[model samples]
Target: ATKAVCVLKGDGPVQGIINFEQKESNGPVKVWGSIKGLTEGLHGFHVHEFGDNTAGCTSAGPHFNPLSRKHGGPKDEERHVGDLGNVTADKDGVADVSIEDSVISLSGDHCITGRTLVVHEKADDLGKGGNEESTKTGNAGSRLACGVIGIAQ
Candidate 1:
């Protein structure tokens, strides 16, 4: 079985495991995780360009987009490979999401193994916000938390 994981260091002291499961080589990637310690609402979530967390989340650079593209939700056909959309938290402040994304890969040039996973301060507009940064970042607010994507032992 193929395996990889990202351990989130969240704001509000959030924490969880984001794992990637691939049943077959070059097959569909199943991304799932349970991250807690959020606010009572939606928050932007995505894989960033770099994996370094030394300078904090900003060092992660932009979202991972091997092919330059517009920002959109996880379901968009033309969105960034890292554009995973928003994770909505409940009043209790928790958000857990799972996704089967065809655009993202766990290995190779498009490999997600060395990227940074980030949670934002606001809900991602999913590129419908009509602003320049909207298409670039979905106008999501500050990076609240982040983690490095790596192969699991």
Candidate 2:
């Protein structure tokens, strides 16, 4: 089994702590986290290609698509390995999120370790919006926060 964690940060008040666990190579990856200081609504959450934060979230690059796939929701059959869909914030501006993804791993060619976790300012359209941006970004707006994924003990 393997484990990873990320401590999120942003320019404003956004902050978060996320954990990822996998019991076996290429097995389902289980994610658990809580994000705070967001507006009361859904926020797009995805893994970016780089662990870099030299320029904040911008340096993290685009969503991880090792397979060269298009943007889509977590459940979509044809989606980026980085695509984990939306996390909803409550009226109190906190979002406690949990997700299980088979495509995400800590090993192999599709491994997401050393990447960046980004929380977007808006909900992801899940590639169903029929817009050009939907195919590239799921129509999700700008990044609100980001963090580097690191190994966990």
Candidate 3:
């Protein structure tokens, strides 16, 4: 009867709470969060390979691409399961985002449970750069903040 929660991790200020809401099995999950202490700009956000964040954000390897697709926007017809687009932080360093996605599922092949959520230092190119890194990654820059996705009791 519960979904999941991702507690952002970072050196400083890059912390907040994002809650997952999946009312039905394998259905669109309503993702929402209020984060602060950012750069007051757009930040790339995605789901990574692992959920165990105790070691740190780096432990959460590459993006979760069960389909082995290229990096792209959340709306892109050909995008990775982890691609969730950008979140814009205000001048006060606070960003609030709400999204309902069909790509990210709490169960099944697209399940994101036990994965990691990461916030990048730069904007995601959405694979429009026409470069190698563009296909492999969204050119989302360094991993600034991160958190482990876990089941909510």
Candidate 4:
């Protein structure tokens, strides 16, 4: 198994710490971390392509989907690999979350290297009840914050 860490920075005062772990099981990537100093609201979370942390994270490129799939929900069959789902912050602007999935692998010929994490200003619709072509991932708007994914120290 392997691990990666990222620091999320944005316009808000709060900062977030994201930890990624390649699990031994055939489940979603094991993710455990916390977001501190945030506004009470829902934030879109995802893994992006590229690991460039320069420019405060803008250099990181779009969601990591070597498949070049559409922006859809986590479960959506037609979605980008970077779309891991969403994370919501409480009234205190804090969110602690853990997740596991099979789609995300820790090791193999297909590894998620040079990827990034982004925090959106809005929520994802999961492409369930939204525009027909919108896909699964909600039409989450502009990226409020971002971070580059790298090996965990």
Candidate 5:
């Protein structure tokens, strides 16, 4: 089993426990985790490339798309590899997010071992007809919050 720790910083400090294991349903990666201490509402969640926690979380860089795909929705065939869906926070400011994707590997060349978790200021469009590249990032605006996802001790 592969474990990751997510630390959210913005407005307040949020923490998440990430557990990943091999599953037969999707491809090779199945992520299960629960986040706590976030603002109650919709938070844009994604897996960014770098793991640098510098500048709070800006060092994390953009989404983890080694394939150089466009920024879009998860179902988009040409979207970034780190393009997971949004995580809705309950009234208590918490949310549980689980993801299973074939492109996300555990111990292979395309592993997301050192990526970061980013929460946006607003909800994503889910790539509706709002924009030509709506599929990418749902045309979500601004990086309101951020966190680093790393090996759990």
Candidate 6:
């Protein structure tokens, strides 16, 4: 059993907290959060390799691709473990998301703790954009906010 949380902030108005939890070994990671001050519709969401936010989100590095796989939706079989697809915001610029992903973990080799959770400016195409960037970033636009994943006490 393990749990973690991230407090997100950005230069812009976007801010939020995301929580990750697992009840057993090799179980799905339950992700839930509420992000505010976003544009209505979808935004790319993912876990990046580094927890560093020193230079805004640019220092967060790339996606957490331990498997060296291409970017894809959370449900895609051949996606980066950090690929969580998109989160939709309401007309009021608020997004409440609850997702369960089997790829990421809080312990072991693929543990995502100490990584960076990022929110992008646009929707993630789930690697369907057919462009080079799509397979790399899923065409997720600019990084709007990011936070380091830390173990929950």
The per-model lDDT (C-alpha) reads 0.85, 0.93, 0.86, 0.71, 0.67, 0.93
Q: All candidates' TM-scores?
A: 0.93, 0.98, 0.94, 0.82, 0.77, 0.98
Lowest summed lDDT over 10 consecutive residues: which window, candidate 6? 104-113
lDDT of candidate 1 vs native? 0.85
- Please provide, for model 1 over 15-76, each residue's C-alpha lDDT reduced to its tens digit, 9 standing for 90 to 100: 66789987776777888888788887888989999998888889999989989888889888
| lDDT, residue 124, candidate 4 | 71
Q: Which stretches of candidate 5 lie over 4 Å from their true place?
A: 11-13, 23-26, 132-136, 142-145
User: Compared to the true structure, candidate 3 yields what TM-score?
Assistant: 0.94
Question: Mind giving the per-residue lDDT tens digits that candidate 2 earns over 1-153?
Answer: 899999999998889999999998878999998999999998999999999999899899999999999999999988999999999999999999888999889988888889999999999999999888998898878899999999999
Q: What is the C-alpha RMSD of each candidate to the true structure, in Å?
A: 1.3, 0.7, 1.4, 2.6, 3.1, 0.7
- In candidate 4 the C-alpha lDDT for residue 27 amounts to 46
Enumerate clash totals for all models, in the order shown. 0, 0, 0, 14, 5, 0
Error of 4 at 141 (Å): 1.7
Pairs of colliding residues, candidate 2: none
Q: After superposition, how far is residue 23 of candidate 6 from its true place, in Å?
A: 0.3
Ranking by lDDT: 6, 2, 3, 1, 4, 5
Between the candidate structures 2 and 4, which one is better when assessed by lDDT?
2
Model 5 C-alpha lDDT per residue in residues 1-153, reported as the tens digit of each score: 555556566555566665666544335677777776766776666778887777766677777888877766666676677777677778787788787766766555566667777776567666664776465565555565666666654
Task: Specify the poorest-scoring 10-residue window by lDDT in model 4.
Answer: 105-114
- Give the C-alpha lDDT of model 5: 0.67
- For lDDT, candidate 2 versus 3, the one ahead is 2
Query: In candidate 1, which residue ranges exceed 4 Å CA deviation?
Result: none
Question: What would the per-residue lDDT of candidate 6 be over residues 19-125, giving only the tens digit for each residue?
Answer: 99999988999999899999999999999999999999989998999999999999999899899999899999999989999999999878999999999999999
Model 6 misplaced stretches (Cα beyond 4 Å)? none
Model 6: lDDT to the true structure: 0.93
